[PDB]
Design a protein around this ligand. Structure first.
Ligand SMILES: [Cl-]
Ligand SMILES: [Cl-]
Lengths: 192, 192
């Protein structure tokens, strides 16, 4: 059987491998296919920081942080809320449907702070590493790459300092043991 | 003055910072804005592995390689051409206009090898690092992240083993010293 999973970026950088590897081990017969952005229903599961409006299960909340180069010329510790958009920002392309960065660049003034739009947070962190730009990232992602990319990881002094991870699937249009098995697996893997 | 540069992924992971930093230093008055995918003309420059068909200057050729986890269970050295699509692949979303990965997944059989599509090669390498999937990447990118992502970097035994980097801009519809200055700067930075 084939399952088509959408694990929306940037969550594909932690959860896709966990899911792929676990199903590879316990059900080598089952073929899981992964995409990392949205856009056959009964084979579909979405894991995302959005609810796309299918079911919707909130799994966990992730802290979001501010990242900058370790050797930033002026940033040497936490910022005030008013300071944030006086920095130059790197973000994920705002034109992308459900872009990760959208919540924090929803006014002209905030958008004006952006000097670079990349295709994924992983690209964003590479540019932050190499420049004086700042970015807003999940703590887990920033902390994974802080050592190799020489990043400082700071609290985000904005009201929107978390995102909620949701698991979503097509409501049972009939009984389906394999589908229910995958529902249970994905909750377990995500909650772990 | 504002220049709008598109440095198409994955090249934004090496060239965007070089350009941003150099112009920041030598012309702090000039505002360079960056995007990393295509889709005001006289302020526009594109740097990409495509010619989008504006001028078109071929700058350099980059070797493309095969990447896999260092501790891959079966891959322990170079592959034969026929072996490549018998592995499970991670690639950049093929539906994206001018997706980096498109040249290598242009048949049903090749597409069938894909288990994961991500939004950028930087995301792809993170998943390769964590799984048994393989991917096709620029050598410079793979070699930058091989140590931290514990990757092996292998020659690509396919005919399409290089991509050409092009610089492209709007033909002079009138004389423009600032535009010509930026043309000269970008050739210099890219060729260096
Ligand atoms: Cl992302
Ligand atoms: Cl890419």
């Amino acid at each position: 059987r084939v399952f088509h999973l959408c694990v929306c970026s940037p969550l594909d950088s932690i959860l896709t491998s966990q899911i792929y590897n676990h199903i590879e081990q316990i059900a080598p017969n089952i073929h899981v296919m992964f995409k990392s952005s949205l856009n056959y229903q009964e084979t579909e599961f979405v894991i995302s920081y959005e609810d796309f409006h299918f079911t919707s299960v909130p799994l966990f909340k992730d802290e979001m942080v501010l990242v900058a180069s370790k050797n930033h010329p002026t940033i040497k510790g936490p910022l005030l809320k008013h300071d944030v958009y006086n920095e130059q920002h790197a973000a994920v392309s705002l034109d992308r449907f459900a872009s990760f960065s959208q919540p924090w660049y929803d006014t002209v003034d905030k958008q004006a702070s952006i000097a670079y739009q990349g295709m994924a947070m992983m690209s964003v962190l590479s540019v932050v590493s190499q420049t004086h730009l700042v970015a807003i990232a999940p703590r887990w992602l920033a902390e994974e790459f802080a050592e190799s990319l020489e990043l400082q990881v700071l609290p985000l002094p904005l009201k929107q300092n978390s995102r909620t991870c949701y698991l979503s699937w097509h409501e049972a249009a009939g009984r389906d043991k394999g589908h229910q098995w995958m529902e249970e697996q994905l909750v377990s893997i995500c909650k772990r």
